[PDB]
Amino acid sequence: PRKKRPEDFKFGKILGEGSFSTVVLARELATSREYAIKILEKRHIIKENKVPYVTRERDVMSRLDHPFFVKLYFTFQDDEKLYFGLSYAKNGELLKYIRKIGSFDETCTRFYTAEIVSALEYLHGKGIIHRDLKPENILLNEDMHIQITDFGTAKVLSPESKQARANSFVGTAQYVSPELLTEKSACKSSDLWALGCIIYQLVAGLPPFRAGNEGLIFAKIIKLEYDFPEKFFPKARDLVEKLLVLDATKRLGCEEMEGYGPLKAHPFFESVTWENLHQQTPPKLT
Numbered sequence: 619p620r621k622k623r624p625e626d627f628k629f630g631k632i633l634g635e636g637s638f639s640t641v642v643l644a645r646e647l648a649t650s651r652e653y654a655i656k657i658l659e660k661r662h663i664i665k666e667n668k669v670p671y672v673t674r675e676r677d678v679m680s681r682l683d684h685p686f687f688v689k690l691y692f693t694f695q696d697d698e699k700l701y702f703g704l705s706y707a708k709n710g711e712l713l714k715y716i717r718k719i720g721s722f723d724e725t726c727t728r729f730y731t732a733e734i735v736s737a738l739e740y741l742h743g744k745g746i747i748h749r750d751l752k753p754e755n756i757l758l759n760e761d762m763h764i765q766i767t768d769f770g771t772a773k774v775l776s777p778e779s780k781q782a783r784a785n786s787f788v789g790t791a792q793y794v795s796p797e798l799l800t801e802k803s804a805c806k807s808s809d810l811w812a813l814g815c816i817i818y819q820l821v822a823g824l825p826p827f828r829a830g831n832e833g834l835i836f837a838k839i840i841k842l843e844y845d846f847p848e849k850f851f852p853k854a855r856d857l858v859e860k861l862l863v864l865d866a867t868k869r870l871g872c873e874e875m876e877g878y879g880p881l882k883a884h885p886f887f888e889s890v891t892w893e894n895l896h897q898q899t900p901p902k903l904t
């Protein structure tokens with residue numbers, strides 16, 4: 619189609635602000651469709667050497683075609699700014715619901731964990747590592763299905779070299795894998811570590827490695843220093859213990875553990891129908 623331009627849209631509220639981006643709700647005049655438009659200032663990203671992150675985000679998102687990811691519909695630019703046209707995730711961040719509710723029940727924990735597993739299976743099947751999986755980056759659409767976002771720090775592993783490890787230091791402390799801290803590289807299994815953290819957080823309210831700053835958190839991660847609260851659903855506890863494993867080759871779902879089949883077969887997921895999650899009605903959180 620014709621390249622879109624800013625005047626093709628009526629811009630509305632700011633949906634959120636990043637350190638070098640702003641996301642604005644926009645209605646396309648010719649169609650009445652709503653998009654979340656992520657806008658970046660060229661001078662700002664050139665100055666702060668963020669151009670690689672912007673090109674990474676476009677390149678990775680352009681490869682994705684799955685219901686559990688924010689879709690990139692279009693991009694355009696003017697003299698001052700870059701624009702990403704994204705699907706609008708009307709119900710915002712998963713983190714919001716964790717804070718409000720405190721502790722998901724077992725059915726809700728199972729359902730949302732299954733959608734994240736499904737999404738990661740797709741992503742890893744394409745040879746892509748997210749590297750910053752966290753509840754702030756798991757948005758929710760109008761139907762309360764997940765919409766994973768934030769791919770500027772993701773990595774497309776090279777099939778040509780059978781690349782397994784990536785060397786950029788990226789992520790968020792609470793969810794960073796021990797291999798990134800100690801071996802200075804991430805792999806697909808690093809996302810499975812983050813998954814373990816997120817499952818724990820859905821039930822416990824807070825993620826497992828807790829401290830008031832990053833260095834203290836890093837020290838706990840490499841020691842596997844965490845504990846479960848009382849009443850933590852037993853099969854979920856078992857799953858988390860099989861994800862929060864220091865050796866990245868021993869995490870359920872990783873390539874060396876023979877992939878997503880054994881993970882999806884975990885007893886915590888016994889009642890899950892994997893084939894069509896995005897067409898199932900999500901369980902009510904309250």
Ligand SMILES: Nc1ncnc2c1ncn2[C@@H]1O[C@H](COP(=O)(O)OP(=O)(O)OP(=O)(O)O)[C@@H](O)[C@H]1O
Nearest residue numbers: 633634635636637639640641654688704705706707
């Ligand atoms: N597709 C979307 N639909 C609805 N809201 C969105 C969408 N994408 C992002 N947002 C909201 O806008 C916020 C800002 O997103 P953006 O990617 O610009 O920065 P960030 O990732 O939050 O921050 P930083 O880049 O500093 O880590 C997000 O945290 C999220 O709340």
Ligand SMILES: O=S(=O)(Nc1nc2ccc(Cl)cc2s1)c1csc2ccccc12
Nearest residue numbers: 660664669672673676693694695700701
């Ligand atoms: O055209 S791209 O393929 N590459 C880029 N062009 C520019 C131009 C100026 C600046 Cl500061 C950065 C980039 S990076 C692209 C990546 S993200 C995005 C968003 C809107 C339009 C183009 C692009």
